[PDB]
Ligand binder design. Structure first.
Ligand SMILES: NC(=O)c1ccc[n+]([C@@H]2O[C@H](COP(=O)([O-])OP(=O)(O)OC[C@H]3O[C@@H](n4cnc5c(N)ncnc54)[C@H](OP(=O)(O)O)[C@@H]3O)[C@@H](O)[C@H]2O)c1
Ligand SMILES: NC(=O)c1ccc[n+]([C@@H]2O[C@H](COP(=O)([O-])OP(=O)(O)OC[C@H]3O[C@@H](n4cnc5c(N)ncnc54)[C@H](OP(=O)(O)O)[C@@H]3O)[C@@H](O)[C@H]2O)c1
Ligand SMILES: [Cl-]
Ligand SMILES: [Cl-]
Ligand SMILES: [Cl-]
Ligand SMILES: [Cl-]
Ligand SMILES: [Cl-]
Lengths: 286, 282
């Protein structure tokens, strides 16, 4: 019975492992050039979850020997003001990557602002250009969460080619890039959303299921195919352990492998961002 | 029983008001809209397609700038030509006819076309913009298919669409356009297992494989909407990527081959050129 239980896809462990390599790379770069890699983080407004995510990302920068430039803008910031701040960061040669923490206050055209980030500094992978390049096999930083997921799958030797992957959710920065990344890895990919009919049946057809709906435990455990690889990209704070977008209680009897929540996708989102920032700094300072 | 999704008729209809628009623009500005067409090398089908596209331009009162480059053209040479066209204020749209000779990095060359002139919808930036709901010219073939479906009042929202093929200029944009129209979308390709199974569940099936009659009639769901984007010339009538002989007994609606998707590929390109000229000149 112990042997037949699902493989835990341990994002926490993998993130720590990647960070050890990032640290030596950053220290080498600092020694050679005298300069520290910088991630600019932009936090617009007062959302508590956003503030926490930015704090965690800054901490990850420092863990690998980098630092962050913390830009904090008021909740009433306009699109025009945010664009101007991004252009300042684009023009600053000391800034290697730019993170705009989503979701910005809703009066701002978030897409316009994402698209203003220069490709070379798009270390969270949010630009339309970056998405298009990735979708067509050209070099670009990938959207952090789905790229982190691909890394988890590859480093745990999960078979993707020829498998049926079902991505539930189609957001610009998660579901859509996830789908394109899985397609590039030769999965057959189905993309579902709030207007999908027969969702339970489509999920049951999936060899690989990605929950990206932002609704706690929406994906039911009885929809999961026996032996499926289960990736839960959600996080919803709860007293006594947060939960994701998938019912994971007892998942170890159903899945061949799964990402826990917490400790699965979350750490790899942060670490992917920081890795792409190290790559951007290595390029800029070389 | 099937509705014939008549691309020829729709193209003709659309060209009527494109001609009105172009004649109004010429009268106002004294300038003729120009599509630059780039034919690289000796492929016969490519030459035919480019001529058809130039003819369509002329039917709606525009003109073409015919660029013909040799089979042995290099990536560098083609990029240089595209950059000349980008900076030529007399050129409003640029078409690079696919597939270019194998030694050329076609994707690099597509991506060199300026967004404002990307009237065939081939750039990575244009694809990404489209996929995220931002304004951009759409890849001509899939955008034409969307127009056919919409003009024929085909229900897309909530339907299970299956796109067989994932090319950068056809299957991938087709998938994203159907997704924006609120279809659930499955994208299949040469590594798909159980393709017949998946096709059988398609409410909307798009054949985008470039292999004659690969998609079998027996795989088609009763009542499906069947879109065949293939064309393979044959004596006494070309065929597409789907077996369509007898399709009228199965499909609720289908695109014939020829006369379905093909005319609408051309029309979409010309429409987007009219749009580009109106923006540049108006
Ligand atoms: O903000 P955020 O973190 O919530 O992300 P978000 O940007 O709201 O994305 C959530 C995604 O999950 C999808 N979704 C929401 N409810 C669903 C449901 N009941 N069934 C299937 N898909 C569903 C949404 O569909 P839509 O794209 O149709 O809204 C959307 O694609
Ligand atoms: O060049 P071109 O004009 O032929 O277009 P292309 O650029 O080769 O596109 C053809 C598309 O059809 C797909 N395809 C080819 N054979 C298939 C098969 N037997 N089953 C499912 N999908 C198939 C290809 O899969 P791949 O993308 O897997 O090659 C590709 O995505
Ligand atoms: Cl707010
Ligand atoms: Cl792909
Ligand atoms: Cl011509
Ligand atoms: Cl004619
Ligand atoms: Cl969409």
């Amino acid at each position: 019975f112990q042997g037949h239980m699902a493989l835990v896809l341990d994002g926490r462990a993998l993130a720590k492992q990647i960070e050890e390599n990032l640290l030596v790379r950053v220290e080498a770069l600092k020694a050679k050039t005298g300069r520290t890699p910088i991630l600019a983080t932009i936090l617009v407004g007062d959302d508590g979850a956003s503030a926490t995510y930015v704090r965690m990302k800054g901490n990850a920068c420092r863990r690998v020997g980098m630092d962050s430039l913390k830009i904090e803008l008021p909740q009433e910031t306009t699109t025009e003001q945010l664009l101007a701040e991004i252009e300042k960061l684009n023009a600053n040669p000391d800034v290697h990557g730019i993170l705009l923490q989503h979701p910005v206050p809703a009066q701002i055209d978030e897409r316009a602002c994402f698209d203003a980030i220069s490709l070379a500094k798009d270390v969270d992978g949010v630009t339309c250009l970056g998405f298009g390049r990735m979708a067509m096999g050209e070099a670009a930083y990938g959207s952090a969460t789905p790229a982190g997921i691909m890394t988890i799958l590859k480093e745990n030797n999960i078979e993707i080619a020829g498998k049926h992957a079902v991505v539930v959710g189609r957001s610009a920065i998660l579901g859509k890039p996830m789908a394109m990344m899985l397609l590039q890895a030769n999965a057959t990919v189905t993309i579902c959303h709030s207007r999908t009919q027969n969702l339970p049946e489509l999920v049951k057809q999936a060899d690989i299921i990605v929950g990206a709906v932002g609704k706690a435990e929406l994906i039911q455990k009885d929809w999961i195919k026996q032996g499926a690889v289960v990736v839960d990209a959600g996080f919803h704070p709860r007293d006594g352990g947060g939960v994701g977008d998938i019912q994971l209680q007892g998942i170890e009897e159903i899945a061949s492998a799964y990402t826990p929540v917490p400790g699965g996708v979350g750490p790899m989102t942060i670490t992917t961002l920081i890795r792409q920032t190290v790559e951007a700094a290595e390029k800029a300072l070389g």
